[PDB]
RNA sequence: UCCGCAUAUGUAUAAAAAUAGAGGUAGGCUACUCUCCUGUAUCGUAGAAGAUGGGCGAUGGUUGAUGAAACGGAAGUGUUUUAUUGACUUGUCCAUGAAAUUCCAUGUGCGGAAUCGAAUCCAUUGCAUACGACUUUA
RNA sequence: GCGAAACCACAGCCUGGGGAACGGGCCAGG
RNA sequence: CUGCCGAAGUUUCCGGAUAGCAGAAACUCAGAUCAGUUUUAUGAGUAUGUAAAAUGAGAGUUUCUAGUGGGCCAUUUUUGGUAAGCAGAACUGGCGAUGCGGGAUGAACCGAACGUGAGGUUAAGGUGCCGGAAUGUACGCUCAUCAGACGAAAAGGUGUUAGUUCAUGAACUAGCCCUGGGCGCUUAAGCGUACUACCCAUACCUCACCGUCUGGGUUAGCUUUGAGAAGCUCAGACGAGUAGGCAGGCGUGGAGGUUUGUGACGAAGCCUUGGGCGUGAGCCUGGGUCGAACAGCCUCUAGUGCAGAUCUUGGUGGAAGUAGC
RNA sequence: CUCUGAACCUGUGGUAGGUCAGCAUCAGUUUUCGGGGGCGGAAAAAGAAUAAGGGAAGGUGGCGUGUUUAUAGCCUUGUUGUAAUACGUCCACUGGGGACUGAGGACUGCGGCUUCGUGCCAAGGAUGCUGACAUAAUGGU
């Protein structure tokens, strides 16, 4: 629909291929894309399925394990990286594990065309990228899975403060008669 | 979409046959040209009546008399496969005879990887009795208490701001 | 500063092309907010511009513009075909274009 | 072609005579240029054609006959004073004027 | 990739180009002639509108072995006046009703050089019309095809 | 009938840029295996008669006039009846004395001169 | 530090969580109700690119400028709290000015010096060693 | 200090495939 | 240099006479014939053949006159086969003289055959991203830990989905899964079917222009003046091309004529990211350099045009300041 | 007397040429939405609706069992004034939006208006109304 200068995507529950194709098309469209929570991506198939896929990849190159490096590789294969246009589009992508401080205070959007709950049939086994990465070499799973609660607790406290603050204007809305005097316009 | 045509045909009269017999079949085709060709092919392989010596005397599309009433249709079909000889019978619950035949074609072309030319319908009947229903799936659909949640909900404007509710 | 921008934002996606042949004379433009080929009928014939800046202060100004018009929709998703007075440079893929509201039939 | 006809309530304009507004009324003054080849050099001409008084008189007459019409209907005087613009999320193909 | 047997028949129908069209009197000598070139042509029954609009928009006549458009009734009269055809409507009437001088009226008309259909053909074009293609006899469905090529 | 050019680039001989011994004057390739003669994709174009320009606008300069070569005052006076169709072009080997005489004569005849400023100075 | 030279268009939107659903819910762990069913929403949006005044309502919302204290570690680099000092205050009502644009075209960098440190060569050394280059000490 | 000659279509990182070597030169990748 | 025409690539006897294919000339001829075509019916054996209907095209010639006298991809029919493949005939067309869209890429697979362009529309293929185009609609199969998208194969499946038969079950049938281009995809971005949208070829349509061919008009040369009749004008169609054939042009040295031609106020040559003309060979010109001759047109003439010849002569490179002295 | 647009004063009279851009009336080609109107089909089938009968996915009553409109109704059948709608097809019926093109160059022609018209017209190919610039605009290398 509409574009922003920087789009932050919360990759929790997003399929790897579906999100990467959407992100790659947005990168080539002239947009700066930041994907957070790259360790919460999902891949269709059981744990052993993509395990052998990655183990075969290890047999083949600079083997990267971090979840963002997995996602960065998936996006790169969907770009014309052999040309200057593809390389320039790649540099506009920032994939990270977790939500760093510059991004945890910014709004994060989701891609419905890539969400697992709207694309995978219920009862289908799936493999999370973060869990899959943890046994193939990634060693920062525990510390990032511990820090998220600290971010969630701080963010939850912020939402409660914002919700409590909003209650005042919400009550003051219906308090003002002009809200309903000219509410015939649908507002 | 498919259309049900009733086609009546007969051989060209000759000195041996002053007046020939009339042969009528109810067959499904997207257009009248397909129905006439299928009718001649059925006559050629059932009555050994050549198209050159025969002519179509009538053709009329038939609409479903009660398209707003749920019905159960049993279809007897003949499958031409690698073996080339199969007899099958299926039951579909829908509102029109056309829909059941379309559903049958979709089912067999999917499961059995068949084609329109190979599949030939001997008969389509309407099962008006619950006891006459044979398939367990259709019997469930006729139970007094159909009660199930909405299936396969799945519901440009990319980059939605909030998580989908995808529920009640 | 929200008392301006009589135009609509747009992006220069590519030229008209087959798999291996490009046609730079006509460009594919994605007007934002237009999400189907029926909504692309509103923007047909509208003036579109590419606005960029160059080092030289020629004309006593730092900004230069390439004008164009929207000819027809492209595809099903609301992209349009635009012909510019000068063919848009290939470096402007993913750049921003402005779709005015004139010539208006509204 | 360079104008959007909004659906705002119409103003009463039948009162003001508009027969004086023709293409010659708005036409730019034709070039006569009475000079000599002594002041064209040195640029000693300073030719200016600032708007004459009758144009302001016509504008005042139109304003006087129009202001009560826009004053009677509410929320219209400053509506004409405001400047139209597009904000975030505005889709002109969907918005109606 | 056309067999010489089919090439000869199409040259007899004046179908030298793809999308070209002609009016043909339907008889036994033609019925089995079209059977040979069935994979390479499509044909059917034209209604009045198809005949009427073809002669108007795409109507050209062979005058001194030249493709002269039928923009005036004097063009038709100067070539088919001996058969009492004096206008486009007389030419349409001779073609649509297959009059006594149909062959002269039909041979006067240049083969209709039609355009590609607006909307395309079906997904597979060279299958027979019965099997979901676009080749062979299609009866009243030729009109719907002509409305795209006109 | 404004002047239209079907093509403005020249036709350069194949491999003329690779080799200095090979000039850029067009030569029709004769090799059967050469892709330029076979007219493959991406290869350079070849002079065809379809590239020929309109007969009415042929030989016409961008201002609509045809260049007429002039060597003396007799040649300029020839364009008295064709000053709207032809422009005078003084030859390169005409001296600066004759060039002056040609230019004054062409001015009275209303004849455009393509190179009226060559080999001369001005003094007002 | 001196000298010379060249001179984006509203950039507005922060819980988490699953669909075999959650969020929050009085009350005192609940109970049950409510909400969704996307942001087509919310925040902002007048002013000759946004003037001059008279003001009025509220005696206050935005902010600039400084003085600030707290919070923010994951890459805190920003979230507030303000103390004031000035303004616009679209909250609202008036009076002036807009035009002949009389139909679209829209300090920063280099090259020099006088300086302050540091490093290498250097007194060096074999610790290193085809040479490079390396390590110590004047 | 003095001082050659042979040679020279042209560039030159690998894995696969391009059927007639395809390779170094194409295609898909690292 | 451009334009136009354009093969054969093989029957028969036997290096050729041929024939045949492709052109030139000399003809006659629509009240006439011709055909990689279909017919009518009966003749003979659905095929085959027949004389005289449909459709298209105006046709028949006589003479001589260049080039070729192979194969490959194979399909199909087909003979022998032989572990099995495979081989042998004919047939069929294509490539061979043919570029273009697709097929991930591709000498033979699917589309389509080509003057220069604008616009439109398609074919074959496709529309998750790379990549132009629906992360379209509807109905089904499958979760593959070696999915699928492109013989170890017999079977095994306490792997299934649907149905048929007999009838509580039993088996059977058919199809998916396992064992035996990239990124990625899984109620798919796989497979099957149906349905609308969309993408684009040198293809199709409309228009402009180039050229070729064909047909027509044009003199008491009318104040429409547009008679270089070798001119002017109107119309329609067409455009691959090896060998080969035929036209028209560009350029060079010298000769006869001509321009009452150019030139020390600068000829010729040379240089130049100056400008222009021609489809092209080429030509004109500005500036710079330069210093004595030179050109256009008509005709004549020839030691007349170069990228190749392990070409000739001369000059100069990388190797290389290397091997070395 | 005529002529020399003859020189200058007088006019400050009147018209003013090459690249770009905008719009409007058109013609050619084309694409894309919409409004109506005929004619076909089982003169659509349905349905609303007049109505007789029946059964149960037995409703409602009666006693989960059986019921027959109860205090729901369902289906079938003829049937209530006719239809409507969808689909197919046609209009020499009609209203908008977009894009590319402007070849030709006195007059002829075929047509339509017009009482007739040196008449007018969308009828053998684009014109009209404007705006911007020479120290710039526009293109080329």
From Swiss-Prot, chain A:
Task: Report the subcellular localization.
Answer: Cytoplasm
Q: Please state which protein family the record places this protein in.
A: Belongs to the universal ribosomal protein uL13 family.
This protein's record includes keyword Iron: no
The keyword DNA-binding is annotated on this UniProt entry: no
As one GO molecular function, the record gives:
mRNA binding
The encoding gene is: rpl1601
Q: Which residues carry this modification: Phosphoserine?
A: 183
Q: What does this protein do?
A: Component of the ribosome, a large ribonucleoprotein complex responsible for the synthesis of proteins in the cell. The small ribosomal subunit (SSU) binds messenger RNAs (mRNAs) and translates the encoded message by selecting cognate aminoacyl-transfer RNA (tRNA) molecules. The large subunit (LSU) contains the ribosomal catalytic site termed the peptidyl transferase center (PTC), which catalyzes the formation of peptide bonds, thereby polymerizing the amino acids delivered by tRNAs into a polypeptide chain.
Q: Which GO terms describe its biological process?
A: cytoplasmic translation; negative regulation of translation
Biological classification of the source: Eukaryota, Fungi, Dikarya, Ascomycota, Taphrinomycotina
Q: Which UniProt keywords apply?
A: Cytoplasm, Phosphoprotein, Ribonucleoprotein, Ribosomal protein
Q: List cellular component terms (GO).
A: cytosol; cytosolic large ribosomal subunit; preribosome; ribosome
Protein name (Swiss-Prot/TrEMBL): Large ribosomal subunit protein uL13B
SUPFAM superfamilies under this entry? Ribosomal protein L13
Principal location: cytoplasm
- Superkingdom of source: Eukaryota
From which organism does this entry originate?
A: Schizosaccharomyces pombe (strain 972 / ATCC 24843) (Fission yeast)
Task: Give additional notes from the record.
Answer: There are 3 genes for uL13 in S.pombe.
Curated annotation (Swiss-Prot), chain C:
Q: What is this protein called?
A: Large ribosomal subunit protein eL33B
Give additional notes from the record: There are 2 genes for eL33 in S.pombe.
- Name one process (GO BP) from the record: ribosomal large subunit biogenesis
Q: Say which family it is in.
A: Belongs to the eukaryotic ribosomal protein eL33 family.
Task: Say which domain of life the source belongs to.
Answer: Eukaryota
Gene Ontology molecular function: any one: structural constituent of ribosome
SUPFAM superfamilies recorded for this chain? Translation proteins (SSF50447)
**Function statement:** Component of the ribosome, a large ribonucleoprotein complex responsible for the synthesis of proteins in the cell. The small ribosomal subunit (SSU) binds messenger RNAs (mRNAs) and translates the encoded message by selecting cognate aminoacyl-transfer RNA (tRNA) molecules. The large subunit (LSU) contains the ribosomal catalytic site termed the peptidyl transferase center (PTC), which catalyzes the formation of peptide bonds, thereby polymerizing the amino acids delivered by tRNAs into a polypeptide chain.
Organism annotation: Schizosaccharomyces pombe (strain 972 / ATCC 24843) (Fission yeast)
Question: What binding partners and quaternary form does the record give?
Answer: Component of the large ribosomal subunit (LSU). Mature yeast ribosomes consist of a small (40S) and a large (60S) subunit. The 40S small subunit contains 1 molecule of ribosomal RNA (18S rRNA) and at least 33 different proteins. The large 60S subunit contains 3 rRNA molecules (25S, 5.8S and 5S rRNA) and at least 46 different proteins.
Q: Provide the primary localization.
A: cytoplasm
Q: Where in the cell is it found?
A: Cytoplasm
Name of one Pfam family that matches:
Ribosomal_L35Ae
Swiss-Prot record, chain E:
The similarity comment for this entry is: Belongs to the universal ribosomal protein uL30 family.
Range within the parent protein: 101 to 250 of 250
Subunit structure as annotated in this protein's UniProt entry: Component of the large ribosomal subunit (LSU). Mature yeast ribosomes consist of a small (40S) and a large (60S) subunit. The 40S small subunit contains 1 molecule of ribosomal RNA (18S rRNA) and at least 33 different proteins. The large 60S subunit contains 3 rRNA molecules (25S, 5.8S and 5S rRNA) and at least 46 different proteins.
Gene assigned in the entry: rpl702
Species this chain originates from: Schizosaccharomyces pombe (strain 972 / ATCC 24843) (Fission yeast)
This entry carries the following GO cellular component terms, namely: cytoplasm; cytosolic large ribosomal subunit; nucleolus; preribosome
* Leftover remarks: There are 3 genes for uL30 in S.pombe.
Q: Which GO terms describe its molecular function?
A: RNA binding; structural constituent of ribosome
Which UniProt key words apply to this protein? Answer: Cytoplasm, Nucleus, Ribonucleoprotein, Ribosomal protein
UniProt record, GO biological process: cytoplasmic translation; maturation of LSU-rRNA from tricistronic rRNA transcript (SSU-rRNA, 5.8S rRNA, LSU-rRNA)
The places in or outside the cell where this protein is found are:
Cytoplasm; Nucleus, Nucleolus
Indicate what this protein is called per its UniProt record: Large ribosomal subunit protein uL30B
From Swiss-Prot, chain F:
User: What's the domain of life for this entry?
Assistant: Eukaryota
Where it mainly occurs, coarsely classed, is: cytoplasm
Single Gene Ontology BP annotation: cytoplasmic translation
Return the SMART domains for the record: Ribosomal_L32e
**Keyword Magnesium found:** no
Coiled-coil spans in chain: none
Residues recorded with modification Phosphoserine: 74
Cellular localization per UniProt: Cytoplasm; Nucleus
| GO annotations of cellular component type | cytosol; cytosolic large ribosomal subunit; nucleus; preribosome
Pfam families recorded: Ribosomal_L32e (PF01655)
List cystine links.
none
Q: What does this protein do?
A: Component of the ribosome, a large ribonucleoprotein complex responsible for the synthesis of proteins in the cell. The small ribosomal subunit (SSU) binds messenger RNAs (mRNAs) and translates the encoded message by selecting cognate aminoacyl-transfer RNA (tRNA) molecules. The large subunit (LSU) contains the ribosomal catalytic site termed the peptidyl transferase center (PTC), which catalyzes the formation of peptide bonds, thereby polymerizing the amino acids delivered by tRNAs into a polypeptide chain.
Complex and partners: Component of the large ribosomal subunit (LSU). Mature yeast ribosomes consist of a small (40S) and a large (60S) subunit. The 40S small subunit contains 1 molecule of ribosomal RNA (18S rRNA) and at least 33 different proteins. The large 60S subunit contains 3 rRNA molecules (25S, 5.8S and 5S rRNA) and at least 46 different proteins.
Q: What does the record's miscellaneous section state?
A: There are 2 genes for eL32 in S.pombe.
Write out the similarity annotation.
Answer: Belongs to the eukaryotic ribosomal protein eL32 family.
Its protein name is: Large ribosomal subunit protein eL32A
